[PDB]
Design a protein around this nucleic acid. Structure first.
Ligand code: CAC
Ligand code: CL
Ligand code: NA
Ligand code: NA
Ligand code: NA
Length: 327
DNA sequence: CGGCAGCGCAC
DNA sequence: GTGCGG
DNA sequence: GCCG
């Protein structure tokens, strides 16, 4: 759906990113929601009244929208800190957010070279830095597919009945992907256990995993690995690879969560809430039990969901294909 | 105004 | 406990 | 930033 408000959304995106790299996460979020509404409007917004009719756009946002529409410029951009470009440069490093970016800037650092030379780095950030270029580029989905295949092959060597699926933008059908999330489980509900570790050993021993960002993360019965891989062959770049092993009873919700997008997941939690339910990568549950003070005193009951559609059904929603989950 | 999810990790 | 990314 |  062509954007009939590009000259607007463009300027709005610049201001958004600026708030984002400076810590104003919520304000940046608000902008993002309005920016999406605009991109997909059935016509170029021509009035402040029209703008306000679109959910996600309030008085403040309409003000700016109409200013750009009529004047062609956004005065606020003219007051955006000189630091923004550098804060964005530094935050492009995996492991460094706004606080770290700000710290570096205040220490006089300006280039990725200053960072490499005089900045204190965490293990993750150091890895993020030497793979700056590689990590900044989105890979063709074909490469994501080879990466998924590499993991699945090494995994089925331990148990042929294991189920492996690449999620993220890749599962949403995007031509290119920023990383790869391989979700693994087993239909028998139990044989996924004792797979995670030896799967990582195997992949390391075959030279596929080049660096670890988080070797192991335990979230309930989910085991997650955040790392870096590089397919065999010359000319291959290093890529962000995540591996998640979950028990079959949480497969659908894990699938839903890791497929995203982040905006989709957020809209689904909001909906679940209105129905008195909660949604996580673990399950769809009835809302938690809380005392008079309004505080969790007892967990909700998990509502079984064998497949993704079971999740939509219980939320009273029509199923949406992965391809239609950008928002 | 408070909520916009909750999480586990490195540090 | 904070920063960060999923 | 927006929403209720
Ligand atoms: C427009 As209102 C009720 O969010 O202040
Ligand atoms: Cl499913
Ligand atoms: Na970053
Ligand atoms: Na506020
Ligand atoms: Na977060």
């Amino acid at each position: 759906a062509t954007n009939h408000n590009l000259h607007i959304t463009e300027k709005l995106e610049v201001l958004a990113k600026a708030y984002s790299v400076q810590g104003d996460k919520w304000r940046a979020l608000g902008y993002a929601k309005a920016i999406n509404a605009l991109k997909s409007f059935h016509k170029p917004v021509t009035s402040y009244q029209e703008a306000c009719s679109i959910p996600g756009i309030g008085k403040r946002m309409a003000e700016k929208i109409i200013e750009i529409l009529e004047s062609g410029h956004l005065r606020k951009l003219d007051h955006i800190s000189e630091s923004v470009p550098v804060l964005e440069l530094f935050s492009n490093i995996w492991g460094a957010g706004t606080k770290t970016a700000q710290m570096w800037y205040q220490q006089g650092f300006r280039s990725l070279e200053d960072i490499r030379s005089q900045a204190s780095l965490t293990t993750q950030q150091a890895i993020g830095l030497k793979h700056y270029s590689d990590f900044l580029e989105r890979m063709p989905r074909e490469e994501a597919t080879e990466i998924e295949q590499t993991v699945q092959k090494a995994a089925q060597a331990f148990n042929s009945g294991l189920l492996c699926v690449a999620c993220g933008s890749y599962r949403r059908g995007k031509a290119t992907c920023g990383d790869v999330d391989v979700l693994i489980t087993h239909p028998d509900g139990r044989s996924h256990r004792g797979i995670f570790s030896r799967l990582l050993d195997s992949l390391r021993q075959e030279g596929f995993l080049t660096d670890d960002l988080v070797s192991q993360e335990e979230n309930g019965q989910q085991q997650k690995y955040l790392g870096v891989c590089r397919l065999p062959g010359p000319g291959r770049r290093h890529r962000r690879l995540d591996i998640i092993v979950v028990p079959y009873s949480e497969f659908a919700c894990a699938l839903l969560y890791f497929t995203g997008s982040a905006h989709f997941n957020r809209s689904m939690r909001a909906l679940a809430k209105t129905k008195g339910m909660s949604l996580s990568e673990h399950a769809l549950s009835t809302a938690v039990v809380r005392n008079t003070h309004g505080c969790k005193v007892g967990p909700g009951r998990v509502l079984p969901t064998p497949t993704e559609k079971d999740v939509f059904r219980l939320l009273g929603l029509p199923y949406r294909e992965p391809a239609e989950r950008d928002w």
